[PDB]
Fold Solute carrier family 12 member 4.
Amino acid sequence: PSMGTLMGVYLPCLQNIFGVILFLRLTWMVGTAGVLQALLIVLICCCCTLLTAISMSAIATNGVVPAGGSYFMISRSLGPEFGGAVGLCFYLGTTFAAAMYILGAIEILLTYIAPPAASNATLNNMRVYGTIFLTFMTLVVFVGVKYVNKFASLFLACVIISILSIYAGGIKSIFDPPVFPVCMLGNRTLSRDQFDICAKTAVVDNETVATQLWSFFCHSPNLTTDSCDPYFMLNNVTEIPGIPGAAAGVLQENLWSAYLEKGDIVEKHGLPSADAPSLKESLPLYVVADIATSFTVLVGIFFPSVTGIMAGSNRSGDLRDAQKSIPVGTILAIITTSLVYFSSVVLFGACIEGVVLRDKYGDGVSRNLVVGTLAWPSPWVIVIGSFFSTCGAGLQSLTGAPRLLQAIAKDNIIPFLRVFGHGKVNGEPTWALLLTALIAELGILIASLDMVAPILSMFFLMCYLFVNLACAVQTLLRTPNWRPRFKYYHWALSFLGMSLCLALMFVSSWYYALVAMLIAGMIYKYIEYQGAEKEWGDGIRGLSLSAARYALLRLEEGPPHTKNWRPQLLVLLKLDEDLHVKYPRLLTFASQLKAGKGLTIVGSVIQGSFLESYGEAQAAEQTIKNMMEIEKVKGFCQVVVASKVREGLAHLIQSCGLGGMRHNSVVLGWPYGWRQSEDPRAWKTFIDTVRCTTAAHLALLVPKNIAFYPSNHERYLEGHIDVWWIVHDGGMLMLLPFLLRQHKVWRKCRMRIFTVDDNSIQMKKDLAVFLYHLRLEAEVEVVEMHNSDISAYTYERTSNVRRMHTAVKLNEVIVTRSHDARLVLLNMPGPPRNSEGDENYMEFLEVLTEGLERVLLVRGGGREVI
Amino acid sequence: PSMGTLMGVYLPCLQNIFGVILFLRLTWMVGTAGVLQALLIVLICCCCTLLTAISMSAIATNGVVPAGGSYFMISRSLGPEFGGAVGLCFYLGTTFAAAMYILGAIEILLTYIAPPAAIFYSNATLNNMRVYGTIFLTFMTLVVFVGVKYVNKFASLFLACVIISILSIYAGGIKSIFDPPVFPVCMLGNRTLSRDQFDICAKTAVVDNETVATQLWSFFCHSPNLTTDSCDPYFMLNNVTEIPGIPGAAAGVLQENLWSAYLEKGDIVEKHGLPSADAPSLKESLPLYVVADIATSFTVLVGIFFPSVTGIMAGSNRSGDLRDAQKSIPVGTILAIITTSLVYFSSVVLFGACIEGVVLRDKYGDGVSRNLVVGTLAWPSPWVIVIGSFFSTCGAGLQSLTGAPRLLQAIAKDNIIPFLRVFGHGKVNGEPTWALLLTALIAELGILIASLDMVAPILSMFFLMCYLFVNLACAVQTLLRTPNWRPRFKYYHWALSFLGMSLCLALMFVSSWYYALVAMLIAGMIYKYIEYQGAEKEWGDGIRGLSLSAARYALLRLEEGPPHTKNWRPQLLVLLKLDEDLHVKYPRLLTFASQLKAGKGLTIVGSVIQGSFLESYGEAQAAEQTIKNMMEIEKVKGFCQVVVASKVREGLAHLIQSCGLGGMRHNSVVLGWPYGWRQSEDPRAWKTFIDTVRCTTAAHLALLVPKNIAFYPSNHERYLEGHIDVWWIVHDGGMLMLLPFLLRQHKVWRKCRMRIFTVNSIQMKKDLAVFLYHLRLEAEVEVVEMHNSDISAYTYERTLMMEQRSQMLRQMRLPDQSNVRRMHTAVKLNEVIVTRSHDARLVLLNMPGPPRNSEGDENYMEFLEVLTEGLERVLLVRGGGREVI
Ligand SMILES: *[C@@H]1O[C@H](CO)[C@@H](O[C@@H]2O[C@H](CO)[C@@H](O[C@@H]3O[C@H](CO)[C@@H](O)[C@H](O)[C@@H]3O)[C@H](O)[C@H]2NC(C)=O)[C@H](O)[C@H]1NC(C)=O
Ligand SMILES: *[C@@H]1O[C@H](CO)[C@@H](O[C@@H]2O[C@H](CO)[C@@H](O[C@@H]3O[C@H](CO)[C@@H](O)[C@H](O)[C@@H]3O)[C@H](O)[C@H]2NC(C)=O)[C@H](O)[C@H]1NC(C)=O
Ligand SMILES: *[C@@H]1O[C@H](CO)[C@@H](O[C@@H]2O[C@H](CO)[C@@H](O)[C@H](O)[C@H]2NC(C)=O)[C@H](O)[C@H]1NC(C)=O
Ligand SMILES: *[C@@H]1O[C@H](CO)[C@@H](O)[C@H](O)[C@H]1NC(C)=O
């Protein structure tokens, strides 16, 4: 499969864009709204579609492009939810567009080609003929798709020849225009259909006689009468040319808005008219404004002529290089359409009279196509051209909507429309064509372009808005599979497009837009629910599972370092032989340090064998969950069954969490009665866990004397927290007391920073400035720093007899200056590298915290920033 | 602290609801829209507020009630995001309510009490309103700054004034029923003259025995002589009448003003039902007819009326001083709502049935001699309602200026929004300092509009936004089963909150769509900003913090509830085996996992690395990166765990039983096959395999053992001709049937034929078919018969048993018929299967369980090996026992 850019993307988009709006409702819109507001409307209607094209290109470049069609790309790149929701709005837009083309073909057939073979009489004629055409076209679509696919080029050829003839006619108008006199009465517009000639009196047989216009306006067939309307006799009868050759005087005339009302009269601003009352038997003789015109009405009526940019990306499979051929083709088609509309708006505004443009059905002229008056070969080419264009566009929409419905139905996303996949032997849908025809019937029964157009606009605006919103969100939140390769693409453009198309969608009709948005939201949430039920098994619990998995997958990619550091704890509880929580104060302390916000996993090891001890593990899981719910700490609970507690602890420390939801702090208790008993298990297990948690670059919190920690019901009124930051680990040693006091239990305990040659003023200024950002502003008291005393910390981080001496002097200082303290925090030195000096390290740590009622030791990990 | 329901909740709510809208704009609203549509308006505006009150009660019952106020309950019960968003919309509503009350007090001062004291006399009225409103706002701000205590003392007085005013109105009506008052309004044809200028409404009067033109003549006709014919035709063509303006209660007047009478801007107020002969008129007469001031419709009346039913959140404002709040707040709020609704209904009907249809439409009471239209019917004198409404408006304004800065100060001290930290700098006593100034500035910006009919819709928009948010939050938290949300209200159901949200949204859009859009965007912006700040405070980063918070919330919500799903879908854990150089040995397992999941579901990929953790951290990190790259290649979306154990066995066990977080657990273990187990002398392989099998079968997990993984297709390969074979023997039918369907759903097996081979036959086939109908696979069913004692003994089987004995002897160095019987059966089964299913693409058969004795594993391996002998690709599945489908 290989065809170029032109005949694969460009020409289909052109064939889909050029519609009936140009022929039937451009002149009326230009005359009613002027040239300025016309240019503003065209610009507004091209900007939304251009930003949507930018989003479509950004979608069409990331990754490979699926070869199925124009709906499969959207789904593959935005998820089944988005793709499914977009498909239905697009399907409805396409079927109503087919309906609108049928109405246009009927209107062009019954008004100019042949009116004899035909208020509400027109509405009934339109209804009947539109139903007959819809039936015949549906049957044709059933039987003869091959002939449509063969003849599809002809419709584009006719459109191109028509537009070329219009522009050539304009150029011939510039120096020698055609003649099409429109008659005037003062500053009113007479319907030229009835009268033979517009003149009050005519000369027959050497004398003057009343003309048909007189007898039609005056019921008397004798000139000698004075029972007629005052407007007829008071004013004159003029014949101004309707096609003034290109000049700057006409473009000066029709330059300001001319919004009429329902039932008003089409008036030629710039002719002498003396007002007067009038009878009621004359109204069937003036041309009348048919519908109320405004700005929003014109937006709604014109918009369906710039839609169809998603029909270009429809031969993805038979493309040479889609990444470079789809975006350029779409944007070139958009630009070409925008320039044709700009040029046509200016040409119409500046070349034709401002009063003959407002006859929607060409009443000023003798029931001709108002836009067909200027055309070189003959005014008869535009009628046939627009007829074939409307028929071809209707046929192609009726061919392309059921195929899309069958595609959506076989994907099995929405379950209640499984039947619509009952394709033919060849694959052509069977019970989807009937549904489409029924919807087309429901649309034809309205039988008025000016009322079908706003619904169509709502559907297409909804589709485009959803595409743009999806692109913007997926670019913002770093979706895992979303990286576009487009050069001129930035999510700000898609955001602006979403805003613009939403503004249009609400300008046209607020209630219609609300209904469309509610339908879209309902289908979106229903797709999400069904997908959850299909992946996992349950509805609500499935929703929660899907949200969790999506969030974790999105969090996987990206730099794995956070600019700030907050403790996320893993509380290692130690269950008893009877499966009871030994120290329920660790859970209380964890709840006080977290305050119910953050991540808190609670692991525990049970010695034995997994093969025969599963129920014990589950029972312990329930026990820990209950005890954890009581103390009001919101966290998960893991229980593992190991053979020896050492390896269980290791596997728990290095493997807990899912991807980015990892812990970064291990809070383990203190070993009690280690020196009393002869079994040395306790201290070796403790030191081994310490050595294993410092090699994983994790913080460490060892609350000593856990039997004196407060409960939640207790309250403190007088007391002062004590910090004894010695040398290193400053960030977390300063961050802990603040997070602690953030709880009501320590709500007002005074903080005192004690910091063990050097300069006290520079140090004080640094500590104070650092505290300024934190805002704790706690008093700083720096005691003397003796290098000989801290030798133990300096040598181990970066002498056994010396160890004890330094520890006893430090303990003396702290116990004489901080004995009555509430909580004492000091950073502990690292364990020795030699595996045998563990007894000395334990004796050091024990004689260091001798006397303090409540002492918590923290060891930094080294990757802490603040 | 303990005070009852009445004097603690009921009276404050009553005092906050009854406002200035009733007096200044009730009669005008009733006359313009008729009685029926007025009742409909009142009903619509009471239903939204009633449903919001029910939701507020459901909020006020769950748990303990915080003693702070009306904002702390909402926050504690709905989360910082919701609570913060509600606080700002409520704050804006309260400050604009203060603005509206000041406007009402100014209007009542300049129009009825004393009109001479008007600086400007169009736009003169607007300029007078602007100046006087600014002066009042300044003076009220100073008073509120200095004297909050006296306000809290005098708060009862305002309610006393309101109650006496309403009682006087009803007394006037009841006195109207049998003997009404006198208030003649003069008429011209069918128009309405301003009675202020003329002395008497009569074209001519008799003075000194003769008739002379009256002031009305000189005002309508510039000539002071009767003998003139240069006046407008309407005056001479129609007579002048003097109808009573207060007709006593009857069914004829309530029958007259019963249908809508929406006028337009600048039209004339006409009395439908009087003889009128039309004619042209001059342009110097318009200053003498009463004129409609603004264009009237239905939506305009909804917008103007809504601010008279707001304030139901002021009842839950003495939370601390309550006896038992759970039983005292809802009943108090709902009783206040019911009383207000009944008073409005009764007053609408009374006005409709007691006053003329032409004097209701004078917004400023022009038909009567510049009186308060509602004050015409009042027993003691029309002077009680004027002063009553004046003092009530001042008091309500003062209380709003007292209660808005307090709410702002609470929000500022709560530290949710960071840029308004300064607004918590209260005085030494706690009275706000820089929150009062901001409130006064916003109130001035609101006064500069100077028109009740334009200020009321903004107020309504803010309050409607607050209520819609409360209702939506309540409904969502009840639906999704939030962990800490269990309300105790008896008559409460999430359908009611949903209906309330819909109705109040409809109201929010009827008044003015664009204003509603602006309000919704402000609310959404503050909601997302609060969420972002909470993320930055809990975790450390902005964007990544959002994802972590979403994950934690979802897992926590999924924690509670029944832990069994009605369906069973495989969630795999692929146990890869890394090489000695840390390279993936079998990268085909990842391919198979990607084909079986198809990128949707959970897939954890664990692996054990032998050694010591203390010195092998970098190896673990490198292996994790390697697995991530290799996993990205095979297009499988999953997480990756690597642990460092001492023996691979315990690593595998700890990996099997501990992977995930709460409810996001796996339920299927796919491990490969051990190759060369009997070839080599090291027996580690088969014991490791058997140990993992027994450990994964005792946890009730499914099992997938793809044998001969080197012949499985890749993703680029495609299959055109072939048929999957299932050889389901006895049990585990559900999963044995669910696997091939999920398999063929991938394009690699997109069209492989399924054949069900099953070792009364017709009844079983009918059952399989009916079961298959729901699944819809419709695969052909062939039931093969089962033979007995086909081969009594096999010589080769005996030789194999001897070989096994020799193996055991070698192991020792460094009943045969009964044991053989099982091998013989396996040989016969392998014969049938290999002769009827050799050419199959993929073969699935369920494997027997491992033996209970830990030593008979060698025989089990020999059995499993001779079973799949010859088959190119064979996958064995073992059920866990808790599988449902
Ligand atoms: C303005 O007021 C006058 C008088 O109050 C209204 O005209 C009165 O209409 C009644 C009803 O027909 C007349 O009663 C009878 O009129 C006939 C006419 O010939 C007379 O023959 C009878 O003897 C009897 O008077 C009454 O005369 C007539 N009065 C006048 C002065 O016209 C009039 O309808 C009111 N409304 C307007 C002028 O729009
Ligand atoms: C109050 O007095 C005014 C002034 O005469 C009355 O206005 C006129 O009342 C008639 C009552 O039907 C209206 O009749 C309509 O006339 C049009 C022709 O313009 C006709 O097409 C309709 O079918 C109908 O017959 C008339 O429009 C109206 N004219 C004006 C300028 O107001 C008015 O009706 C009297 N009553 C009330 C309740 O206003
Ligand atoms: C066309 O004729 C109508 C007939 O009156 C003109 O209408 C008048 O326009 C003047 C100009 O301001 C107004 O003051 C009158 O009140 C209008 N009378 C009516 C009955 O409409 C109109 O201006 C003429 N020219 C146009 C429409 O361009
Ligand atoms: C009507 O036409 C006559 C003759 O052309 C002319 O004299 C007269 O002024 C015209 N009326 C007006 C209002 O221009």
Notes: The domain at 715-866 of chain A is CATH 3.40.50 (Rossmann fold). The CA atoms of residues 828 and 857 of chain A lie 6 Å apart. The two ends of chain A are 60 Å apart (CA to CA).
